[PDB]
Amino acid sequence: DITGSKSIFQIQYNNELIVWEPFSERFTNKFKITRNLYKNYYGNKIIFEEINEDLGLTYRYQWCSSNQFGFVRKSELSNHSKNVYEISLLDGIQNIMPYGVSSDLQSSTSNLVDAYKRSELHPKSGLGIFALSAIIVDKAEPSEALKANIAWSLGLNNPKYLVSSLQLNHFRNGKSISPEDDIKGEKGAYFLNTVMTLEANTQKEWMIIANVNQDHSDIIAITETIQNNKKIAEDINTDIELGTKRLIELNASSDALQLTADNLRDTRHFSNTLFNIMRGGIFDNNYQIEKGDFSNYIKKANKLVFDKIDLNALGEIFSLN
Amino acid sequence: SITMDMVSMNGEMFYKIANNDAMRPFFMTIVSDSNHWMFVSSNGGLTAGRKNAEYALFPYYTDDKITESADITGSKSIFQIQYNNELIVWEPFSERFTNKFKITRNLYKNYYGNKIIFEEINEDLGLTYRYQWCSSNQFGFVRKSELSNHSKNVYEISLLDGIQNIMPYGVSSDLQSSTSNLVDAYKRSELHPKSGLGIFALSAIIVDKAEPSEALKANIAWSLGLNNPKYLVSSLQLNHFRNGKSISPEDDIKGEKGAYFLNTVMTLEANTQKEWMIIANVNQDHSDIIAITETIQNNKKIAEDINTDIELGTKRLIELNASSDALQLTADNLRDTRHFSNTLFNIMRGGIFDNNYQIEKGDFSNYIKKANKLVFDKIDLNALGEIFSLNDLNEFASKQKDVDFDRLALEYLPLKFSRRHGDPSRPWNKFSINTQSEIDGSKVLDYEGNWRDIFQNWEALAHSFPNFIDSMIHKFLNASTFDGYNPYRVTKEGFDWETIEPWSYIGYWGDHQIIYLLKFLEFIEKHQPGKLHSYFESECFVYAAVPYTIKPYEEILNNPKDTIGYNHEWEKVINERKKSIGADGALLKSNDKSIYHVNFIEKILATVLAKMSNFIPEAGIWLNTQRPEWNDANNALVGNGVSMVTLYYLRRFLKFFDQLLENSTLENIKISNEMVEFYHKVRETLMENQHLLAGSISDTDRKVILDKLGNAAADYRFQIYNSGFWGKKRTHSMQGLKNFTKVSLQFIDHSIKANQRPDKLYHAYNLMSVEKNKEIAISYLSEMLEGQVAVLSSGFLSSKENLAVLDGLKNSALFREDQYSYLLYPNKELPKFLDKNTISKEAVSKSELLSLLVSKSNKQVIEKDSIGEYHFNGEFNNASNLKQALEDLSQQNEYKDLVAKESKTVEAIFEDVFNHKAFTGRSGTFYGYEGLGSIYWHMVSKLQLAVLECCLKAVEEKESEEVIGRLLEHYYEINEGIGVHKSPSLYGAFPTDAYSHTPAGKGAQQPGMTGQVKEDILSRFGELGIFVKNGCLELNPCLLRKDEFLKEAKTFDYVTVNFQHQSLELVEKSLAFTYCQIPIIYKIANQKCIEVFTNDGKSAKAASLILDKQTSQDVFGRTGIINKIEVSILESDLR
Ligand SMILES: [Cl-]
Ligand SMILES: [Cl-]
Ligand SMILES: [Cl-]
């Protein structure tokens, strides 16, 4: 309810404002709903889905990974009713950690950490910066926090932004929010607020991207991309699919791929193999070895041997043979 | 919408916050007379237990997580209500059914702070549900439930009500915090069918050892008041019921969080109410559980016995608090309630005396045994009874002719009820309420506390028990070191010092000595004039052996952050003496004796000379002892920081001492031979530099003076660390000491005059640096509240100057508008993330190294972003990270030379970007606690007391009524800021409860045991005109407002010194309070008069409001001779 994905919709139906908060337990048995959960055959994507059967509205969000961009939350709001709906939506992620809090400190002393939080919005780009005012340390010495966690968005028109969960309940109670760009002392969050007309038999999509361990240069690169790169959505989707492709290549090298009459068995063999190579490893490239890695390994193993053996006769890459 | 009213609930008065759910949830401590603790949010989320976190009923987490846990932990109630042919589900206090019903939520807390009620009105159904938490020494926690039908309908209701996420016995708070999932696998919750009692245990105590580990205790919950209940011992079916279905009884659930739920079906008629209770307790063995099961089955009056024990709890709470003058009755119950809670939080932290001035032989005898085995063997306590007074002990001691017994007898403090101030909002502090023996639950007479916290609490406590002041003074002095400092903690047994575990080091706090000692010395001289004089030549004081070596002066000057080593060899000798003697083994010996004894004059010189040895003219007292002063958040000022704050209080200390010496008729003093050189070198340094005070002091002369003072201290301590005290003393002139005090005051006064700002505020903390190794330069820091508090406390400024300071303060950046009170230092905008760390293009291009690193796309030190701006590497926290990176670069051939050439240049660019030379600590770099925009209430209340003392000075010296009036206006406004009359939404909690701080973005944070309360106790006594001077009590308000006086008749229920609960009838135009637990009634009258009523049935009247010394001693001595005092006050003297 307080951490991760959160979505609230204010829907004009008749001359009534109706509030729907999918995946929450905030409105028990208010609506007939169906919840479905999806996971892909490779295990690297998951979709949460709620159908509001009273409104003929479905909300889905999907988690994907991107080596380049971090985590990508892809959202779809689908109107399969015969009605046109005026919807004001608040959607995003909450209890975003700032960079540089140890897991130990967050576990034992979360309240103290809050006093060091500062969440900001970069106005031009809509990117959210989740940082500390200082790295928390016992020493009586300066301790600058020069990295951040981030979240940003594509696909919604002229959004208002929150960088905290302070106004979430106000929205839940059918009221409108004020934009935030600088909140101190509170759990980080990243929410988009937009108003849209969702026609019958139509679907609206958007995505939120979040990443960790970002320095000033990393953040400027994203802000520039948001402003100048017309194909940024495509580049994100390309990097997601590259991820799947690389996952398949790793696993397939350990005989993960089978096709029988029974996809459950085929899928289980895939995941078995993945969990095996995740724990024990997979070979880099068949029986191929790199001179540089091998040379470093010998250096650490036995300095006498490393001094004595001349590896010049071997190429930059060579086989086990 | 959010109002606060007084409301009777079942015949008991509570404060009610209406619509409490419109406030951001706030955190509370529910107090007990016993060993209960309970930390609860206004939303219902809680942790609770007995003694400490290792006997938690509900899991012990930080206050954010407690607040966030309300849906799954603690109280839970679901009602299935048949109306029409519809089953309607209502879950009060939950967020499960948002806006399903029109509801009102109200929160109640009683005047004593030991009961809380949560209430939800379902306005659509005309149904109200309330539950109340109470404590019982015998039974544990009691949750009293009421379901009230105020509709015109009859309802068929099936209810599920109880408590969930009940801890099993024997889970450590550490394990529950870090590994709660593993704990679940060991849980087994059971129901005892015959009784309905729930048993919450582990299958085994969780341990790393490969050994059996039986879990032979449990937590329990049981119930009264419901007919034929079904029971759940888990939350597994909660959601089934939430969805309108019926439940199956449970009596054995493994692997799941414990819960205890009752299910019954009832017909609730119109205009009727149903009641029940749940009782829960911790740390129960098989015998304990059988006793409850038997009681449930056979004891017809068990409900009454529970209610009796709850009320006994309240009564005992009142008796404890009343003994420290907690009970007042004025026209304003908010003020009366705040005074009650202030006093409670004071005695909770510092303790309360067991029984007036009464001492038990057994406790006392055990204390002597632990203190000094030689003394214990030698002293025959037969002549004393099983119980005896402080006076009886003094008389007994006077006959034994043993100075070590004198000291131990005097130091004895029969305190109880103290505990450390840890809680979910102060999770770095471990707490344990160790007030009942583990063997038989009898009272425990013990105490422990951090130096500053406990001596602060005791100043307020002493007012109610004045004859213990000598005890406190000796405890303080005798726990001080020869080099003028003290260990970090005091205990009944003696004292504890910090040890070294890293970047871990020990030290001494600069503020610990002067002001805290002074308040006690001021107290005794008011109550017992001449008593301090009687100790001038009495060699009954000792020196605490704390094994810290303060380094030579030249090493301190060289690096004033590296100044104190732990002496492990000294430690071994102490531990050996402790085995051989007891606690007294931690006292310095001499060449001659096991325990070295000195007089009061020597003890004062020890602490004064240590401070003066760190005196930097025009700057203050150097902070160079590896610990800060009061403000931990400015802890990086240790090293080059200098305290004007301590100098201001030293001015007050030395003026007091100057007058004390002047009133003496002793012609000589007697001090350790070793101290003579030190005392003389310091005195001489000041005498021969006094000519400089005609103007300002150069940086050259500043160093000449500090070098002489510092070298003198260093030679003294070197001699004692290496050779010890030889045991000989020398006779010197009293005139010479008066000369020393006078010249010390001349230097301090000159320094004060050099520390006024243009805005009329005073400097709090300055910086020093050593220049051309021949000069000491001073620079200045921001305006700080603490400086204003200290200079206004100094006694140095005139009334007009005090008022100019306070006018400056009101108009300064320290005034925070929304709460109309004071910050510690200005709020400031910190740089936003993308503004923190940019290197100018010019600086990069002018550096060959940085330009080369950019060229080669090396990112170890500097990186260039895609709009062409330059940044230091994002991993750097400070210069030490930069240095390390430059050394890594210097391993590479192409960088080696440039790194050697430009390292200093690059480091200077770093310092230019980050300005770390200006860092004073986390105070300027965070947004809670002592941080930016935060009001830290203890310091505001110290300001209030200082302003009061300024008001009393102006009245006394007969300033113009304009000056008196303007000073009083400051007093009343500061008091308003404290917030007792604010709305709950502005205060952010119950305004009658103290909290540590209010940050910029939230209401009050950290409930209860703040040191603020001791200041507000003292200010309240000042307001009521309770003054002691020349051994005489005066009851004569000059600052008290007319509106404090009652507008209607009221009954004052109070407790006498002999624990009798009695009543007085007050009329209009009067009020009441107690002092030394005597009730005092003020009444408005045509003529001043005091009337003393004695237990012989007589009374005695005079026009003077100053009592004589003998009558005053009868008050202070708590002998029950005086029954009450009535004081007739002029309307024209009220404000
Ligand atoms: Cl502690
Ligand atoms: Cl303490
Ligand atoms: Cl001696």
Author numbering:
A (entry chain B): 89 to 409
B (entry chain A): 19 to 519, 523 to 1156
Task: Give the published text.
In order to advance understanding of the specificity of GH149 enzymes, we herein solved X‐ray crystallographic structures of GH149 enzyme Pro_7066 in the absence of substrate and in complex with laminarihexaose (G6). We have characterized two enzymes from this family, one from the microalga Euglena gracilis, and the other a bacterial enzyme from a metagenomic library, Pro_7066. Both enzymes were shown to have substrate specificity for β‐(1 → 3)‐gluco‐oligosaccharides.
However, useful data could only be obtained from the G6 co‐crystallization, the structure of which was solved to 2.25 Å resolution. The two copies of the molecule in the ASU form a biologically relevant homodimer with an interfacial area of ∼4230 Å2 were calculated by jsPISA. The formation of a homodimer in the crystal structure is consistent with the gel filtration analysis, where Pro_7066 was eluted as a dimer. Bicine (BCN) derived from the crystallization precipitant was bound via hydrogen bonding contacts with R470 and E951, possibly mimicking the interaction of the enzyme active site with the hydroxy groups on C3 and C6 of Glc1P donor. A sulfate molecule was observed (ice blue) occupying a similar position to the phosphate moiety of Glc1P in the PsLBP structure (magenta).
